[PDB]
Design an enzyme around this catalytic site. Structure first.
Site, PDB file in Angstrom:
ATOM      1  CG  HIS A  61      62.564  10.252  60.736  1.00 56.61           C
ATOM      2  ND1 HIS A  61      61.459  10.920  60.248  1.00 56.61           N
ATOM      3  CD2 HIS A  61      62.229   9.828  61.976  1.00 56.61           C
ATOM      4  CE1 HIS A  61      60.505  10.915  61.162  1.00 56.61           C
ATOM      5  NE2 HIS A  61      60.947  10.261  62.220  1.00 56.61           N
ATOM      6  CG  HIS A  91      58.465  16.170  57.938  1.00 48.86           C
ATOM      7  ND1 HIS A  91      57.153  15.890  58.255  1.00 48.86           N
ATOM      8  CD2 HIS A  91      58.746  15.443  56.827  1.00 48.86           C
ATOM      9  CE1 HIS A  91      56.675  15.007  57.393  1.00 48.86           C
ATOM     10  NE2 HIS A  91      57.613  14.745  56.504  1.00 48.86           N
ATOM     11  CG  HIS A  93      61.352  14.055  53.050  1.00 48.16           C
ATOM     12  ND1 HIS A  93      61.450  12.886  53.778  1.00 48.16           N
ATOM     13  CD2 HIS A  93      60.113  14.545  53.277  1.00 48.16           C
ATOM     14  CE1 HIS A  93      60.293  12.658  54.380  1.00 48.16           C
ATOM     15  NE2 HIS A  93      59.477  13.680  54.126  1.00 48.16           N
ATOM     16  CD  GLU A 103      59.879  11.446  51.083  1.00 46.04           C
ATOM     17  OE1 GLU A 103      58.737  11.727  51.475  1.00 46.04           O
ATOM     18  OE2 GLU A 103      60.604  10.577  51.626  1.00 46.04           O
ATOM     19  CG  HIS A 116      56.207  15.927  53.118  1.00 49.18           C
ATOM     20  ND1 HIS A 116      56.794  14.683  53.185  1.00 49.18           N
ATOM     21  CD2 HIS A 116      56.120  16.230  51.804  1.00 49.18           C
ATOM     22  CE1 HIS A 116      57.043  14.253  51.964  1.00 49.18           C
ATOM     23  NE2 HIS A 116      56.622  15.158  51.108  1.00 49.18           N
ATOM     24  CB  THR A 195      57.125   9.128  52.394  1.00 54.54           C
ATOM     25  OG1 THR A 195      57.637  10.161  53.253  1.00 54.54           O
ATOM     26  CG2 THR A 195      56.076   9.690  51.412  1.00 54.54           C
ATOM     27  CB  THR A 196      58.669   7.947  57.551  1.00 55.49           C
ATOM     28  OG1 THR A 196      57.569   8.713  58.041  1.00 55.49           O
ATOM     29  CG2 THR A 196      59.713   8.910  56.936  1.00 55.49           C
TER      30      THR A 196
END
Ligand SMILES: [Zn+2]
Length: 257
Positions: A61, A91, A93, A103, A116, A195-196
């Site tokens: 992801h 990590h 996004h 996000e 993040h 958020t995951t």
């Protein structure tokens, strides 16, 4: 398994993770005119000088850089936080185009990507216990815009070739996360969630107001990663972001006027 596609994306997650419709979900839109300046908020303390990075991994992801969190090496303190939070991993996004990928949003503005840095409260002993507590994690969020290159990001970008597909990892020692930070530590803060999945409501969010600039070549490297494992149909790892969730009964506070 959950993901970011039409049939397993964010609109589906609540079926396996009902807290997806909870009272303190993340990300959120940061309305800069409604956020309230809080004079009691302390400056953030980011102590990364002794960080010990270990590996870089494609988890299906995102890609993440993991750190040794067995001692207080790289910690986050101050700001809205009570106590000491250890850096475990960072990590990103990102999007398929430069106008999407973050996000959090700022007055509905979407950035090209979002970093993040994930920290856990040492009073809970291990990260597994921390994610079950309302103040278990502190995530430092940093926006990425496309412009000039970020020199401190290049070491990451140059190894992504070696972790193209889900499950691949590589040695990633001696990486200095200070090279990913903007000049200002001015921030917004609010209580939220991962958020995951499992979307646990255990996060103090600290979102920096200043984005970092990365080059188009750097973000292009992100977009060459793959969601799939080696040998499966190639599906570019892009648009691995959850959209803004309802603010509900929450106030976003600003450390700055
Ligand atoms: Zn994240």
């Amino acid at each position: 398994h959950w993901g970011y596609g039409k049939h397993n994306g964010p609109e589906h997650w609540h079926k396996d993770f009902p807290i997806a419709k909870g009272e303190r979900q993340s990300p959120v839109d940061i309305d800069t005119h409604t956020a309230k300046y809080d004079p009691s908020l302390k400056p953030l303390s980011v102590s990364y000088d002794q960080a010990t990075s270990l590996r870089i991994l494609n988890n299906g992801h995102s890609f993440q850089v993991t750190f040794d969190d067995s001692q207080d090496k790289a910690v986050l303190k101050g700001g809205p936080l009570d106590g000491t939070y250890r850096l475990l991993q960072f990590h990103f996004h990102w999007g398929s185009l430069d106008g999407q990928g973050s996000e959090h949003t700022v007055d509905k503005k979407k950035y090209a990507a979002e970093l993040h840095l994930v920290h856990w409260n040492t009073k809970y002993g291990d990260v597994g216990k921390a994610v079950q507590q309302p103040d278990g994690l502190a995530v430092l969020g940093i926006f990425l815009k496309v412009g000039s290159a970020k020199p401190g990001l290049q070491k990451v970008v140059d190894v992504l070739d070696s972790i193209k597909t889900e499950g691949k990892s590589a040695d990633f020692t001696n990486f200095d996360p200070r090279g990913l930070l903007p000049e200002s530590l001015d921030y917004w803060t609010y209580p939220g969630s991962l958020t995951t999945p499992p979307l646990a409501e255990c996060v103090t969010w600290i979102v920096l107001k200043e984005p970092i600039s990365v080059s188009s070549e750097q973000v292009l490297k992100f977009r060459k990663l793959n969601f799939n494992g080696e040998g499966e149909p190639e599906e570019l790892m892009v648009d691995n972001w959850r959209p803004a969730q309802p603010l509900k009964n929450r106030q976003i506070k600003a450390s700055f006027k």
